[PDB]
RNA sequence: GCCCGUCGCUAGUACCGAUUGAAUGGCUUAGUGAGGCCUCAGGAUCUGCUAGCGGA
RNA sequence: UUUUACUUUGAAAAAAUUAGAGUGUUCAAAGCAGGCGUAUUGCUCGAAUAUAUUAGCAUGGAAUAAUAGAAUAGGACG
RNA sequence: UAUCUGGUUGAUCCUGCCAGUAGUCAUAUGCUUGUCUCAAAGAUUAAGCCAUGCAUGUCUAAGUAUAAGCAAUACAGUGAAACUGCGAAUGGCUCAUUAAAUCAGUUAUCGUUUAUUUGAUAGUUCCCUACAUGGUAUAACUGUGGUAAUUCUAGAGCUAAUACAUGCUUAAAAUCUCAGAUGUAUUUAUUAGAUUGAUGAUUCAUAAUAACUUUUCGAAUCGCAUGGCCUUGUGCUGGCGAUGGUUCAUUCAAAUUUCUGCCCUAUCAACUUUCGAUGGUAGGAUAGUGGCCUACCAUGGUUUCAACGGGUAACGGGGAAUAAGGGUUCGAUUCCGGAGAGGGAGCCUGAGAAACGGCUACCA
RNA sequence: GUGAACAGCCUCUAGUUGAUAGAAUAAUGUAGAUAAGGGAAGUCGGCAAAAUAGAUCCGUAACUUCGGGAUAAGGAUUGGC
């Protein structure tokens, strides 16, 4: 199968290197699992020492963070906006790490309003307790008059099974928007 | 290759084992256990050429199936049993117990100890670590695991095992001036004092030493065992003490009986 | 001599790469597969012989279908299998009418009767107990060794 | 290092999380680390703003095989240098030597500056290449 | 005295040589491409739950 | 407390093999044996040592051979 | 044991080779061959082809026994077959490939997997069984067969588990959320980890918060003794073990890996880079690092200090022969490492195989 | 317009619709074509015909007067949106 020795892939100074010691199962690779949206479908591999990986074929929620208040919400993925690798796994809408995704919010959004009740986007001194330092920022809040909220993918999928991940912010934010709005 | 080898053939056999070269083909392969597969003794090795009690390696099996022998204060029925250094072999049959330490040429000395110092044995505390859910833990020598030690026991250091509570009861750090084995190298079996510990960090650290005969040998740090401050060893020293004499003392020594 | 397969649905033979639980192929070696040629799954005029499971008897007994009938081997092991048998309830101590047979080889006719897994026995509920009761102590036993340790860090901490 | 932020993705350190919350004095958190072996993290490692995950202070490897010297012969791959060692190998049969070279690349941080000359120190590393293997710990642009 | 070369015979060795000679092996463009593996599906019949709904 | 080469010492360089200590295989090649008083309810010596010097490591030296200091002083100590 | 001698001449002194001479665990072969010890042995040519037979099976007290198998009120002993578990990845053989490849010495894993051994380690499980759940399970066994033929197996009737799948009991104490949760396993994010542990060095060990899981682990197991207390009951407690189990450590290992060192050849001087060559970013894949693979980007990387190419009747080394010293030649072969099982390639199981006395296809 | 194009094909302005006609559809002809399997066995001879063909990318030998041979040979792609 896919191998990862470097006895082929040709040495430094360019000499084509005879083979031997023919294919070794520890020197393996496998095809990607090329991680779809929506009706979650993981598969198990079987990987060296009898540990186990997870496949996950279209995913359609993940666990994303917030990072700025630790809340870390379970939500759906709607789709792929941005990748840094590939544009075809924009287009094809693929679920991998690093890849900019749209996720539903509506959790992040309630969790904002029964934990400040400062109306983000449209147990009684508590609030008042969480002070006046409840904005969050003008970039992540106008995101919610939409409902959907740029993230960022920071678990493995076909490594791991899941696709969580975090909501991006500050200069991160700027950054990704900046190339959403060059690339669109 | 495809998996680990379970033969082991002569001459590939650790030499301090003393085996005969044309007994066979092979020789005891030391399983799996605390100490190592070089620095081991097995049983069968302890029992059919160093206490000659057994003839044979089916002779050694039958002495080890009827709970005689023990190792550290468990039965340990296996035939290839890796004891090593500082392990105590117990039999309630010709009951004495041996320490396995090593004698000046290197070699697991037969050393015959005494019941009322058989229950602890020493341990050169090989790591310091916190383990699951905060609790700290020492791993020694011979990959035993204590939990909660003292907390000013650093790597280095040797720890008293009770071996039937198998917790510490004592402890002894590495500083200049302490008594230390040399359980490796060129000066493995030599016993003495530690005159100064070079870093050599990223290396490998250095330590000197100094025999009761005013001899100096630098050594490797991973192959020094304390046991003890000087004149005061917490275990009993073999019959030459690690003082590595010269072959014409030795030789001087021999033809001293006439 | 090649079987039919169950869902090959071909009128021919044809070969397959054949796994462990499957019909047809018994591995020799854990995880081995081979390849067999095995029957299709419609009938033909290729077929030596078919096999027929009745699952409706209507008219006169055929001369080996009924009034040949072997009984069952072996009865039921299992306490509550024979729970089931047998109708009855939980509280039944089910070791009494449990099936047995003889074997006259010497006029003795000794019973041989089978053993039965899962009896609630004093010894199982002793191996719980000695569980249960290994957990908490060394639960204990680690409770009190983190309050000394406690007290051992407090006590070398007083030194400042 | 003449606009970092020059790449398809976003440039930062691994798990170093800057609060738009709370109102720090710097806003720009810079994570570092001590190389080890007595080799003194440079200024430009402490105040720069380069990401480099290779950097042996800024980054994700560590130093912790061979320390090796060598002369700079090539810098024009990307934060990559090749070193030129020259040794004498001895020949017993004539009792004498020659003169023997191994070039090895080796990852250079934007802390430092280097061009050709300029012996340098490297110190081992998990592979981060190819071919690399060692990355750069001491300039030495002498 | 010693001696050199052509030519002629015998024997041996190697060379050039039309035959777009022949055979073997390595590498390789292009084309076809078995087989297992991953994957998009597919549903024999197999059994559980209330015509439906899950699982293999 | 520039950078090296070089050189001393030490750890290292598996065992077997080699050289080599001891030892009446009957001698020897070999082997790691064995030896000593009895009618034991046994005492004990050994299976050393040297060799690899390529390369790496630790360390003393600073001759020999190379390398750089301060010259448009952008120099050294407060 | 730092040795020479014969041969060019009519004679001489040289150069110079031929020849002699001695050794060879260095191969044949001829003649000869009484004794004791020791014992290489289809390597060279053909890693050419193979008839036949054997070379991997395995049961304790302690997984499963109704053999209609043996023996003098459940079997309790022995024990066929079978299920289950483990092993079969060790060993042994050969040297075909392989020239920076292997290998040797020496490093690293702060870059990973690790069955087994040894040590330590889990009071947190549940939204009408625990005095203990299901067949959704079946083998062997019984009976009916097919095939000329194979360690081919079909239909039918049972039957169990430490097989397969579910599934509780552990109070007590404990901190947050607004009655619930907080064990552990997985994933992500964040925080502490100082000068409250360690390293030369870490985003380390570890802890904490918020959450997440096609959902893990948290013995529904077995043997021998049965003891104690008491309301003498299917009462309540309590031994020694065996097996299994999550995590850490250890051991056996594995996989990459630092530096230096390989024979002849220029009648091989440029090589690599379109089809990855050198590096960067990100992803995928891996057990993990890594152009290992992919997308984008840059134009790099090696070389007269011999790259690249070609040859090897080249596996490398420990070592062997011969040797004043220096050297020369050999090493298929008793040990270590590698590779292969006719040539390739692919893969299942398994901790560990790209296994071949395992499978699949192609080629012969 | 297509197309590299004053190529071929269709069209605009302009011009022509002028060639003796009608009915049938035999052979043999003239001109244009197709053809199973084989593939030059036909024939003096591949005559005739067929095959190839544009463009982009790859790749290109002997020989040579070093300029060529060369579109050598031999391959892949091509539409629409
Ligand atoms: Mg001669
Ligand atoms: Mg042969
Ligand atoms: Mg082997
Ligand atoms: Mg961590
Ligand atoms: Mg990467
Ligand atoms: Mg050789
Ligand atoms: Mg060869
Ligand atoms: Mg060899
Ligand atoms: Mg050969
Ligand atoms: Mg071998
Ligand atoms: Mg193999
Ligand atoms: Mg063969
Ligand atoms: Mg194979
Ligand atoms: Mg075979
Ligand atoms: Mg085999
Ligand atoms: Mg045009
Ligand atoms: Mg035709
Ligand atoms: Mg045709
Ligand atoms: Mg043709
Ligand atoms: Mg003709
Ligand atoms: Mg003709
Ligand atoms: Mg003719
Ligand atoms: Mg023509
Ligand atoms: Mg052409
Ligand atoms: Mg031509």
Redesign the pocket.
Same mark, same amino acid.
């Given at each position: 199968?896919?191998?990862?020795?470097?006895?082929?892939?040709?040495?430094?100074?360019?000499?084509?290197?005879?083979?031997?010691?023919?294919?070794?199962?520890?020197?393996?690779?496998?095809?990607?699992?090329?991680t779809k949206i929506g009706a979650?479908?993981? @598969?198990?591999?079987?990987?060296?020492?009898?540990?186990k990986?997870?496949?996950?074929?279209?995913?359609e929620?993940?666990?994303?963070?917030?990072?700025s208040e630790?809340?870390?919400?379970?939500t759906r993925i709607a789709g792929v906006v941005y @990748?840094?690798?590939?544009?075809?796994?924009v287009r094809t809408n693929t679920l991998?790490?690093?890849?900019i995704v749209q996720i539903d919010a509506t959790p992040f959004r309630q969790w904002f309003e029964?934990?400040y009740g400062q109306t983000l986007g449209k147990?009684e001194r508590?609030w008042a307790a969480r002070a006046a330092s409840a904005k969050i920022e003008s970039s992540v809040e106008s995101q919610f008059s939409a409902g959907r909220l740029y993230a960022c993918?920071?678990?493995?999928?076909?490594?791991?099974?899941?696709c969580?991940?975090?909501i991006l912010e500050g200069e991160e934010l700027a950054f990704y928007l900046r190339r959403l709005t060059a690339k669109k | 290759?495809?998996?680990?080898?379970?033969?082991?053939?002569?001459?590939?056999?650790?030499?301090?084992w003393?085996?005969?070269?044309?007994?066979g083909?092979?020789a005891p392969?030391?399983?799996?256990?605390?100490?190592?597969?070089?620095?081991?003794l097995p049983l069968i090795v302890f029992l059919r050429?160093?206490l000659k009690y057994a003839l044979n390696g089916r002779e050694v099996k039958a002495i080890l199936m009827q709970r005689h022998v023990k190792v550290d204060g468990?039965?340990?029925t296996?035939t290839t049993?890796?004891a090593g250094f500082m392990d105590v072999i117990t039999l309630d049959a010709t009951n004495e117990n041996f320490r396995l330490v090593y004698?000046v040429?290197?070699?697991f000395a037969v050393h015959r100890i005494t019941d009322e110092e058989a229950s602890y044995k020493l341990g050169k505390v090989?790591?310091?670590?916190?383990?699951?859910?905060?609790?700290?833990?020492v791993?020694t020598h011979?990959?035993?695991?204590?939990?909660y030690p003292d907390?000013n026991i650093?790597?280095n250091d040797t720890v008293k095992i009770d071996l039937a509570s198998?917790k510490i009861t004592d402890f002894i750090k590495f500083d200049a001036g302490k008594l230390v084995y040399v359980t490796?190298?060129?000066?493995?079996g030599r016993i003495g004092t530690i005159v100064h510990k070079?870093?050599?960090?990223?290396?490998?650290?250095?330590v000197h030493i100094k025999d009761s005969l005013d001899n100096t040998?630098?050594?490797?740090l991973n192959n020094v065992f304390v046991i003890g401050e000087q004149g005061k060893p917490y275990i009993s020293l073999p019959?030459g003490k690690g003082i590595?004499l010269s072959?014409a003392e030795?030789?001087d020594?021999?033809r001293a009986?006439q | 001599?090649?079987?039919?397969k169950?869902?090959v649905?071909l009128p021919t033979r044809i070969?397959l790469?054949?796994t462990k639980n499957?019909?047809?192929?018994?591995?020799?070696?854990?995880?081995?597969?081979?390849?067999?040629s095995v029957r299709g799954?419609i009938v033909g005029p290729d077929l030596?012989?078919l096999?027929?499971?009745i699952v409706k008897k209507g008219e006169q007994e055929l001369e080996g279908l009924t009034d040949t009938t072997?009984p069952?081997?072996?009865?039921?092991?299992?306490?509550?299998?024979?729970?089931?048998?047998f109708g009855l309830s939980?509280?039944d101590?089910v070791?009494?009418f449990?099936?047995?047979?003889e074997?006259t080889?010497?006029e003795?006719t000794?019973?041989?009767?089978?053993?039965?897994?899962?009896?609630?026995?004093?010894?199982?509920?002793?191996?719980?107990?000695?569980?249960?009761?290994?957990?908490?102590?060394?639960?204990?036993?680690?409770?009190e060794?983190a309050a000394e340790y406690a007290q051992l860090?407090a006590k070398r901490?007083s030194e400042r | 290092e003449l606009t970092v932020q020059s790449?398809?993705?976003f440039?930062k350190?691994?798990?170093?999380?800057n609060?738009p919350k709370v109102k720090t004095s710097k806003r720009t958190?810079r994570?570092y680390?001590?190389?080890?072996?007595?080799?003194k993290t440079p200024k430009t490692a402490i105040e720069g703003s380069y990401?480099?995950?290779?950097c042996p202070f800024?980054?994700?490897?560590?130093?912790?095989?061979?320390?090796?010297?060598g002369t700079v012969?090539?810098?024009?791959?990307?934060?990559?240098?090749?070193i030129?060692?020259?040794?004498?190998?001895?020949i017993?049969?004539?009792?004498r030597?020659?003169?023997?070279?191994?070039?090895?690349?080796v990852?250079v941080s934007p802390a430092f500056r280097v061009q050709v000359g300029d012996?340098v120190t490297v110190?081992?590393?998990?592979?981060?290449?190819?071919?690399?293997?060692?990355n750069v710990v001491k300039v030495?642009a002498?």
């Amino acid at each position: 199968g896919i191998s990862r020795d470097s006895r082929h892939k040709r040495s430094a100074t360019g000499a084509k290197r005879a083979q031997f010691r023919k294919k070794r199962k520890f020197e393996l690779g496998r095809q990607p699992a090329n991680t779809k949206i929506g009706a979650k479908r993981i @598969h198990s591999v079987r990987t060296r020492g009898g540990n186990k990986k997870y496949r996950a074929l279209r995913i359609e929620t993940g666990n994303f963070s917030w990072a700025s208040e630790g809340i870390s919400k379970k939500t759906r993925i709607a789709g792929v906006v941005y @990748h840094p690798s590939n544009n075809e796994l924009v287009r094809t809408n693929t679920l991998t790490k690093a890849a900019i995704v749209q996720i539903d919010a509506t959790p992040f959004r309630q969790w904002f309003e029964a934990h400040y009740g400062q109306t983000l986007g449209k147990a009684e001194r508590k609030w008042a307790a969480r002070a006046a330092s409840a904005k969050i920022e003008s970039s992540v809040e106008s995101q919610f008059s939409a409902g959907r909220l740029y993230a960022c993918i920071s678990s493995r999928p076909g490594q791991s099974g899941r696709c969580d991940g975090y909501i991006l912010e500050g200069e991160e934010l700027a950054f990704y928007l900046r190339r959403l709005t060059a690339k669109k | 290759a495809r998996g680990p080898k379970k033969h082991l053939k002569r001459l590939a056999a650790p030499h301090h084992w003393l085996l005969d070269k044309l007994s066979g083909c092979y020789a005891p392969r030391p399983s799996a256990g605390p100490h190592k597969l070089r620095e081991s003794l097995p049983l069968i090795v302890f029992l059919r050429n160093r206490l000659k009690y057994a003839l044979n390696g089916r002779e050694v099996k039958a002495i080890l199936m009827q709970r005689h022998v023990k190792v550290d204060g468990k039965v340990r029925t296996d035939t290839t049993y890796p004891a090593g250094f500082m392990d105590v072999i117990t039999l309630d049959a010709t009951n004495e117990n041996f320490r396995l330490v090593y004698d000046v040429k290197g070699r697991f000395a037969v050393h015959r100890i005494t019941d009322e110092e058989a229950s602890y044995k020493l341990g050169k505390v090989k790591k310091v670590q916190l383990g699951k859910k905060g609790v700290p833990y020492v791993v020694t020598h011979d990959g035993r695991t204590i939990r909660y030690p003292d907390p000013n026991i650093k790597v280095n250091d040797t720890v008293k095992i009770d071996l039937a509570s198998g917790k510490i009861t004592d402890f002894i750090k590495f500083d200049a001036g302490k008594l230390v084995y040399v359980t490796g190298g060129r000066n493995l079996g030599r016993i003495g004092t530690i005159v100064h510990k070079e870093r050599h960090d990223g290396g490998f650290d250095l330590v000197h030493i100094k025999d009761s005969l005013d001899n100096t040998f630098v050594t490797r740090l991973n192959n020094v065992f304390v046991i003890g401050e000087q004149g005061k060893p917490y275990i009993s020293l073999p019959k030459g003490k690690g003082i590595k004499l010269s072959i014409a003392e030795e030789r001087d020594r021999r033809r001293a009986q006439q | 001599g090649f079987p039919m397969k169950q869902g090959v649905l071909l009128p021919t033979r044809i070969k397959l790469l054949l796994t462990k639980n499957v019909s047809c192929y018994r591995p020799r070696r854990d995880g081995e597969r081979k390849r067999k040629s095995v029957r299709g799954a419609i009938v033909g005029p290729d077929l030596a012989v078919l096999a027929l499971v009745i699952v409706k008897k209507g008219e006169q007994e055929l001369e080996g279908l009924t009034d040949t009938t072997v009984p069952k081997r072996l009865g039921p092991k299992r306490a509550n299998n024979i729970r089931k048998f047998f109708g009855l309830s939980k509280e039944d101590d089910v070791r009494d009418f449990v099936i047995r047979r003889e074997v006259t080889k010497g006029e003795k006719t000794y019973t041989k009767a089978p053993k039965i897994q899962r009896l609630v026995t004093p010894q199982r509920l002793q191996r719980k107990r000695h569980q249960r009761a290994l957990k908490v102590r060394n639960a204990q036993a680690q409770r009190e060794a983190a309050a000394e340790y406690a007290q051992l860090l407090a006590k070398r901490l007083s030194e400042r | 290092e003449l606009t970092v932020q020059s790449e398809r993705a976003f440039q930062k350190q691994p798990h170093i999380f800057n609060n738009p919350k709370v109102k720090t004095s710097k806003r720009t958190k810079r994570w570092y680390k001590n190389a080890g072996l007595g080799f003194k993290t440079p200024k430009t490692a402490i105040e720069g703003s380069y990401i480099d995950k290779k950097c042996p202070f800024t980054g994700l490897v560590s130093i912790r095989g061979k320390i090796l010297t060598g002369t700079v012969v090539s810098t024009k791959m990307h934060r990559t240098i090749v070193i030129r060692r020259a040794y004498l190998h001895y020949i017993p049969k004539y009792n004498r030597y020659e003169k023997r070279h191994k070039n090895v690349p080796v990852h250079v941080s934007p802390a430092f500056r280097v061009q050709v000359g300029d012996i340098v120190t490297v110190g081992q590393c998990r592979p981060i290449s190819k071919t690399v293997r060692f990355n750069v710990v001491k300039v030495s642009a002498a």
